[PDB]
Symmetry: D3
Subunit: 309 residues, 6 copies
């Protein structure tokens, strides 16, 4: 059983980078739309008794990409692939992980069920919005962390990183920032809204680094950055693993005080970089490639939680 | 347990017509998109211990509508609805019902599995592309027929209907046309391609009526109509239950010789009627409403296979 | 189909209170242990075509109680009960809701799967540790809130409640306290550890109210209370929905500065009240009884999220 | 994991031919009936961690053979076989693949469900009546084609094959005949009933070859052959992949004008050949053996769609 | 939801008796075989939202009857019956309930799985060979007992029943006979083979009554009766709930010393009574009818374990 | 894929013996309880693509051990183990294998379902109380037999074994004793209660050996031994595969006339041996180790039914 890497249409550059790091050519697949907008998928090579990895992120036209992924999984499964793994760098509907006093769907659970029923045997993803989403599956889920790469970026790009403060934009992400604050041996601050925001932790004359899983409309991080500049911070950075940047995010970032907005490339960023000078990208394709290769060879994946490969 | 009718965004006029025929107000639901294009659904009323019917056709932005339907089904199911029924007038991915010497998905089966796993207890649909799709489910599926309404339209709109010929555009649909030919006591002709088409059955000086389940790009029916005019037909009609009309269909129909292109309203047609004079619509909302009401009251649904209500 | 209420051995007083509020006698069931410690269950009355509710909390001998609940659910399901609902005021293994860089089980998901496979059709619980646990199920889960009752207790027991500060012991619970702070129109403070704790929000000369879902060993709330007294608070209260109080919790509370430790009665408290003077109990049996009665009658349960019955 | 081939009682000659082509001895199994006609199965060798293939066609006493197959699959699955494959040359109940305005079962779907629940991991079959039956499964299904062998037989047995006409007995099979007509570069004709039949396509002074999936009572092909002789055909052949030949088929064929009735050996034919001189058999055991060997070795099976091995 | 009773072809007299006791007409169903011996089923009336009971015993052509039952269950389930119950007086493959050091199927479990996957919601049966078969299902199973009727027959037909000895033919059935011996206040004897049999318990000058679940070939009961006459018994009776009587059973019984061979009518007996004078039948249709009526009305079924209705 | 052996807390000595016989070190796992008595499990080594065997018997604190086993299975399954096998020497709740005229659970079936849903692929157990429990699973179950070892013990410890009588304590176990009686060529006796017991078979001046699957309270075997001494037996032995010895068993055995009470070590016995001189243990770790090694290597397991390794 050999590795076969197939790309969905969502993020072809990432799939190519992963394929090069694996020393493979991207599997031959045709993924387009019929005239009536139904997703047309044709696997261009035999996947029999192979270990198939399908790379597709929850970005762009999310429902189209999700249906493409499900259809590709189904095609590979009924084509007698030995094992089918969904490599989903940004998990779609991850923020709909609970109901919370609303007659709402748990869309993340629905997506997990659909992936399972399509025939996925394994999920590889990066920085799930809530790690409880792992429990939405009955198949194994490897939730990788961009932190090795975020810490690397911070050390090699922020000269004052030893005196910086890692800041959570909200009470929800505090855990994450504390983890980072522990690995850098720096202070960590929290910010919560009461339209006013309250900040705990000295940030005067120090570089502040907001950290988060995802920036969609960037209202949260822009408000946090305004508050950080109010409290005497020298420069404010924002580091996010998922740069969705939908709606007015680009205009708000352009009007914000960020020195840089660093995001990983779980979502393609070339178009946003054109219209926003201060967006920067941290490659995490090495982490994804190493996770694929370790799942294939039966080596430890959790080794990657703390080690940059 | 009362009837609750909810509309997806795909076909709101049809949902309203069904609700009026049932004497009900469309259930309160908010169905929109978040900024990052994730489907947001909020059920605006309690559906506890109710018999819920969600109307959504496989039309327009098909993957968006399908995800909306799945999310709404899930929301109603975890909101403790007694029973959830998907009313899908045009079934999405119905034409992907087999592999046939290709490493292709069976997308119709995947859609059926997704509907089942979302929590659908029952499916109501009209003129499935292949009735074998009923076997793709383990829940009951009521496949209604537009034929009572097509026959009604033919009798009240084609003055020469007793001397007409019902024509299949291809060998696949012959069964359907024979059924119609049996109910009208008229001749039936077949047309098959060898770029040339061959026609069996006298059509000279007689009105010809092409009959089909769906017109997507209308290449099939336009070629058939050209052949029918070649063979001395007086006028050529086309009657389809699903008027998808994607791609170049409107231009081809405008350049074709059809007297009329009659389609049912399983798919909204107002925009296409603006740009195509010869499109006409047969209301099938009475059949759908009667099917809903009979499933709710435990009356016979198959009664509708031969009776216009 | 009538309501049948059955009690497990974990919390018989709560089951009796619920049964009285429903106007019913607790269903006849024998729930003991064989000599070799296997759980013996005998349903002492017919539950055919009935709506069965089994009350069992995740308290005391947790694995014994959980097995008792699963066995009782199975017995009622194969005895042809029309519907079986598990009323689990404190959900066992709720804190094991994720893996988080550890080769650990997701025990909450396993418990959810076991409840589903035993035959539960519905779950009623109170203040799930993480509401994402709702997504661990495919059956509906009603997660009730003790907040109506906590707010009631605060208003009728703390004379200075209009000038109090609601305090989260950690960053994780902030959401909860903010909700309470919104419903009372008071300030809210956070406390997070860096062995030192940092507090944001003025608490001097004001009554502070720590709020949390559960107190197991009470290290968290005792450290938070010490910090609150350090920061000039006048009195410190602690309000928790689940009073587990295992290990050294009673000694720590006795040595702590709390004016009172208020817990709901999702877990029996009589033994702990004997050895701890400052423990007080808020009855939530009215909320549970109303939820049972509303699920049975098909009325809105979410009405209870904001209304004390 | 080694190949183990087991024979049901339906077609032991085919199983032996397959076993010889694989270089194996048929697995030791006892498959008989108890006195009260219950199917008795005993696997006479260990199948642990083996790749098991059970050969059983839908022929003869169909329900007995189907139950034998299900029981053998179950026995191998609970005996810890690594993988169990059902090799079903003629799929039972394949013609019951839809309801079609009747309160009828979809028996093909029921058979698929029973095969899945018995523990089949994979299905190998030949010329499914409708390829949509593939979607009735969630396990992979390899639907082989007898066409490589039919084309071979036509070329080596019909001297005038370059000037022949391939004829469909009905509108349903036209696809199949067109495929054959494409591979031979000959004309293709259709025949449909209006008790009268209508034929499209010149057949005068040319050899006609009716092609079909199955001959049960042979009314269809006998009527088609009568019509072909009416239209001036020189000789009429019939080629079917499944020679069921039940009821009056042998008498009708004996009284018909066929030069030959060629069928594959998916169903044993020795008894029918005794009473019908013009029946001939095309061996497809090489295709089945190659499919088994390619599924075992992870080679491409679809290679066989166009290549005679 | 009303009761609909449908008969399979196995035991139509029993179905009619049950229907008369329920005050109903047997549901209209056509259950025959196509020419190629595939089971043809057509439900002749609407079963929507009805409580459907299908009566079919594991007798005669067992695999044909079992497939008929599965097909009828499937037809009723996809016809939107509210509930489908299989009434199986004699459960097929019940004696294949374990492997026991053999590479054998557990055919009873396979049958249970097939019944569940066909869509059965409930099973009613009489005197399961092993009551552990109840655990082979996840749906409720009501295993009725013929004992009320056997005890009634013994009292009204054996004048010396107060001084009789109830005898088990083997060690396996001892439980059953002890139950009967307890309800009659008589002695109970066991018989086990060492070709020789050993008997424990005085039987001289006393009437002996062998009791068993089923007589297939009657070797067991004939050997037991020979031994009982050897040990000085006055008359020997045999009472069995299931009179299969396959193979040489009728000849052996005719050559045996039994005063009578009483069997219930879970299996039709008219043909066997023609060739065997000493076979007598105990009607259990009242027990089955009462069980159906009590499951429908939600009354206690276990009431029937000790009460003749 | 390598063998990984993990021990639950129930029987660590047995797990160590098995690991030594396999030439392996017990897998690193932490299995303890949190303060609130929730089971804490941490797999201390990678189990990716490994063949995992978890050893845990149904002994001691049965519900705690069962939950530990389920949690460990779940942890290994979501840690991407290639295969997970539960090695359960004494199966918990095995005696609750049927309902039998009681509104009781089938707890053995519930345990089987829980093991399957936790992710077990395979079960290895010894002397199931009823072999029908094998049918409670859909995964393969290997039910080993202690008989090779019991026969070995009898021959090497009872000098008069050629003239002994093997005695069943009840009618239920007769099969077992007959098997042993067949392998030793000795007489076999039965004992059944009518508070009085009746014995069939000469036992005077002969050594009697009671044989059974399990001794829980030892009332059965103590009453049987009293009866055997009444009937002139010289010495009475008891041999059981499962020595549970709960409740008053030790006192009753101490007051009984047994020469020895031999049990296997499926359950730890060191504590009971301290208080009971006549308990002796037969090691069956060789059978379990050989079964593990044969399932891993794909060799025949049933070879062990008759051969001591």
């Amino acid at each position: 059983p050999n590795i076969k890497i197939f790309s969905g249409s969502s993020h072809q550059d990432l799939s190519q980078k992963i394929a090069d790091r694996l020393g493979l050519e991207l599997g031959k697949v045709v993924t387009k739309k019929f005239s009536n907008q139904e997703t047309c998928v044709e696997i261009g090579e035999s996947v029999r008794g192979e270990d198939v990895y399908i790379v597709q992120s929850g970005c762009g036209e999310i429902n189209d990409n999700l249906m493409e992924l499900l259809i590709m999984i189904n095609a590979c499964k009924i084509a007698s692939a030995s094992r089918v793994t969904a490599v989903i760098p940004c998990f779609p509907y991850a923020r709909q992980d609970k109901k919370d006093k609303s007659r709402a769907p748990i869309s993340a659970k629905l997506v997990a069920n659909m992936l399972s029923v399509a025939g996925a045997d394994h999920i590889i993803t990066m920085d799930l919005h809530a790690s409880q989403i792992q429990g939405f599956f009955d198949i194994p889920v490897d939730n990788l962390y961009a932190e090795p790469a975020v810490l690397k970026w911070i050390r090699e790009n922020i000269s004052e990183w030893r005196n910086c403060t890692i800041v959570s934009p909200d009470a929800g992400g505090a855990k994450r920032v504390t983890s980072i604050a522990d690995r850098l041996n720096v202070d960590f601050a929290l910010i919560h809204k009461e339209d006013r925001m309250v900040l705990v932790g000295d940030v005067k004359d120090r570089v502040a680094i907001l950290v988060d899983d995802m920036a969609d409309t960037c209202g949260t991080i822009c408000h946090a950055a305004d508050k950080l500049l109010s409290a005497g911070a020298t420069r404010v950075y924002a580091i996010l693993t998922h740069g969705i940047f939908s709606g007015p995010a680009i205009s708000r970032i352009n009007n914000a005080c960020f020195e840089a907005v660093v995001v990983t490339n779980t979502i393609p960023q070339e178009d946003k970089m054109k219209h926003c000078s201060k967006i920067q990208v941290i490659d995490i394709s090495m982490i994804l490639a190493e996770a694929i290769r370790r799942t294939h060879n039966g080596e430890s994946v959790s080794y990657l939680f703390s080690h940059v490969p």
